[PDB]
Design an enzyme around this catalytic site. Structure first.
Site, PDB file in Angstrom:
ATOM      1  N   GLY A  67      -2.900   1.060  15.667  1.00 42.43           N
ATOM      2  CA  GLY A  67      -3.074   2.228  16.548  1.00 42.43           C
ATOM      3  C   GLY A  67      -2.397   3.471  16.000  1.00 42.43           C
TER       4      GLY A  67
ATOM      5  CG  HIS B 141      -5.051   9.308  -0.072  1.00 40.33           C
ATOM      6  ND1 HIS B 141      -3.692   9.424  -0.294  1.00 40.33           N
ATOM      7  CD2 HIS B 141      -5.173   8.786   1.172  1.00 40.33           C
ATOM      8  CE1 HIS B 141      -3.029   9.005   0.773  1.00 40.33           C
ATOM      9  NE2 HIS B 141      -3.904   8.588   1.668  1.00 40.33           N
TER      10      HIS B 141
ATOM     11  CG  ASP C 188      -1.951   1.098   1.233  1.00 40.52           C
ATOM     12  OD1 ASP C 188      -2.985   0.888   0.584  1.00 40.52           O
ATOM     13  OD2 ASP C 188      -1.723   2.133   1.916  1.00 40.52           O
TER      14      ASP C 188
ATOM     15  CE  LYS D 182      -3.987   4.401   0.275  1.00 40.09           C
ATOM     16  NZ  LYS D 182      -2.550   4.346   0.666  1.00 40.09           N
TER      17      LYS D 182
ATOM     18  NE  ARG E 262       8.773  -2.568  15.508  1.00 41.71           N
ATOM     19  CZ  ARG E 262       9.892  -2.171  16.087  1.00 41.71           C
ATOM     20  NH1 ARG E 262      10.427  -2.917  17.022  1.00 41.71           N
ATOM     21  NH2 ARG E 262      10.519  -1.044  15.699  1.00 41.71           N
TER      22      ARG E 262
ATOM     23  CE1 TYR F 195       0.205   7.545   2.404  1.00 45.48           C
ATOM     24  CE2 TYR F 195       0.757   5.324   1.718  1.00 45.48           C
ATOM     25  CZ  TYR F 195      -0.138   6.219   2.295  1.00 45.48           C
ATOM     26  OH  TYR F 195      -1.335   5.818   2.798  1.00 45.48           O
TER      27      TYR F 195
END
Ligand code: NAP
Ligand code: NAP
Ligand code: QAP
Ligand code: QAP
Lengths: 315, 303
Positions: free
Chosen positions: A215, A112, A45, A79, A271, A50
């Site tokens: 989050g 977007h 994505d 987007k 991660r 960005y």
């Protein structure tokens, strides 16, 4: 591990989030996107916003060229930024994204945000007093231009982001509609689980794609620093212990089991590789109810200036 | 340990009170604010009136610079003094406060009092226009949130019913403690999603200028003392805890290192429902601030 979209295309249910703040050198997006693919991410994505489409694209090209994946194994999203809602501006913005990524098509092109902004060079155009300048566009005409991008084979699928139900219905009820939105990419997590919107999207065969599922990055520009930290939630932590996983893995898994496609950004190798473990376990129905019980209508993203936009989705 | 305000911002429920009488040198404000941050306080309450914003800001800046905290970890409140209610005077008073504290923004800006004063000489100002100038401060990003202090219900309704209202007050900072628990005002504030923030929660500093000298000393209350024994805490802690379990955000001023560090223990225990009722029973409509010089002001909140 894909979901069938309403246009016949397939979308992997776990996606890699590529946005990082501007203090992060642009080179990193290239490294981390390769890491994500190597870990097992197939859905990626990005967005014009960005400013990383060249790096992200290079990563995808790399892992295609070295034979790890084929282009058809990768689902790549970009987007349309809000300064490019005017219909004559839509195709060239997509063509500019494709040239940057050095890709021939996107798997998914999204509006977007429904919050149109003044056309021009600047992503965030502002006036004499330093306030963002809104624009007014009929988003149905934006959508028509998106439909044409799909018929032109520049985007395999098209959809929306940050739309509310009313905004979705507008498109759904548009006279002469050719393609429904395949998805609505919205903020979605156990503090803002969007169950109502989700039921609506499901009733229309529109996939809800969750961002800030972990989050958010809690960027000072948009997020209050004393808002609760999702991954510190005691219920999330207890389920992590119960399953021998992590709170992030719980939050991701939750989404998958309610029919939601889930994004996860990480620029950390360990991660990144942890997050693909989401397919290794399952939450019980009671685990799911406990997570449902965390809902508190909390959207991490806030803007005093954008709350006054006529198209603000949380109005 | 924060509460969500009606504008989406978050406020820590325990705040540090910085006001000390003028006999207290300002250097102490600097020291004790550093002590408060070191102890765990993150919400810090000051005002133009207090003559301490520079010292309080220097404390905050100091703990940010030495890496104990980040600016975003600190919730800093200032207040607009009553000589600056006229709307053209609002933004420069905030700007002056920001420069004294050397901060870019305040987390909270309050109208200190509804009793306008001539820029004691009263003044007459439509507080709705004061409030509009506060809204423009929030939209300029000078104050994350805006609210009021010492307003009564009627004065709150005036803002709430203002034509063209953009932002509700996030809070009403009022005297509130077990001898004057403000239950009726609290229920009103709750009904409107306005947070009540309690001052003189420990029974006030009993300043000779403002307190009745034979008014009962809150912290000596037998019921407060019995609950402190029961919980192995202190009467101050019981008083602070009481406010937190009724939805109230509580301030606590201390210029003593040990009491400062004691007060942050408020999150370690909880009072029972019956403990709470026993504390509710203490209300005696007692105001530690006496201003009957001010009783004739048209905006006096106790008229
Ligand atoms: N359509 C829109 O308007 C919109 C808005 C926001 C986001 N998005 C998209 O959605 C993506 C994801 O959302 P987001 O950027 O808000 O971030 P997110 O996925 O909620 O959160 C990722 C944050 O959690 C951390 N994290 C990741 N894995 C973790 C783990 N296993 N344990 C602990 N922490 C972990 C990451 O830090 P590290 O990087 O340090 O690991 C990261 O900053 C974005 O990159 C973007 O693609 C779209
Ligand atoms: N908005 C307004 O109009 C308004 C009005 C009044 C006050 N306020 C704000 O609210 C703050 C607090 O209110 P307040 O000044 O009336 O004081 P307070 O918080 O009621 O405290 C009163 C006294 O309690 C003592 N104390 C503190 N912690 C203690 C403990 N753990 N055990 C025993 N005693 C303790 C302090 O003495 P030591 O200093 O010796 O510890 C202090 O002088 C003020 O500083 C100011 O920020 C606002
Ligand atoms: O429209 C936007 C979206 C920001 C953004 C940030 C990070 C992303 O990964 C992303 O995809 C988008 O920016 C303005 C921020 C805002 C916040 C709340 C409501 C309205 C507007
Ligand atoms: O209204 C007042 C006192 C208000 C007060 C006190 C302590 C506080 O924590 C607070 O928030 C408000 O009395 C007059 C103030 C005064 C008189 C002469 C010179 C300087 C200042």
């Amino acid at each position: 591990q894909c979901v069938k979209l309403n246009d016949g295309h397939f979308m992997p249910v776990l996606g890699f989030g590529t946005y990082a703040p501007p203090e992060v050198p642009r080179s990193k997006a290239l490294e981390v996107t390769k890491l994500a693919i190597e870990a097992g991410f197939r859905h990626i994505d990005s967005a014009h916003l960005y400013n990383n489409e060249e790096q992200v694209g290079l990563a995808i090209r790399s892992k295609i060229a070295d034979g790890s994946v084929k282009r058809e194994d990768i689902f790549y999203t970009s987007k349309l930024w809000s300064t490019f809602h005017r219909p004559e501006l839509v195709r060239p913005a997509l063509e500019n994204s494709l040239k940057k990524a050095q890709l021939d098509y996107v798997d998914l092109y999204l509006i977007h945000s429904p919050m149109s902004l003044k056309p021009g060079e600047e992503l965030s155009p502002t006036d004499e007093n330093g306030k963002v300048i809104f624009d007014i566009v009929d988003l149905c005409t934006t959508w028509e231009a998106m439909e044409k991008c799909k018929d032109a084979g520049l985007a395999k699928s098209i959809g929306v982001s940050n739309f509310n139900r009313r905004q979705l219905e507008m498109i759904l009820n548009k006279p002469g509609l050719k393609y429904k939105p395949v998805c609505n990419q919205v903020e979605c997590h156990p503090y803002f689980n969007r169950s109502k919107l989700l039921d609506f999207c499901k009733s229309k065969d529109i996939v809800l794609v969750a961002y800030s599922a972990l989050g958010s990055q809690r960027d000072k520009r948009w997020v209050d620093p004393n808002s609760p930290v999702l991954l510190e939630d005691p219920v999330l932590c207890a389920l992590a212990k119960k399953h021998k996983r992590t709170p992030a893995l719980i939050a991701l898994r939750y989404q998958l089991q309610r029919g939601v496609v889930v994004l996860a950004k990480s620029y950390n190798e360990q991660r990144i590789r942890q997050n693909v473990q989401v397919f290794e376990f399952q939450l019980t129905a009671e685990d799911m109810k406990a997570i449902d019980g965390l809902d508190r209508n909390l959207h991490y993203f806030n803007s005093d200036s954008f709350a006054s936009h006529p198209n603000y989705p949380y109005s």
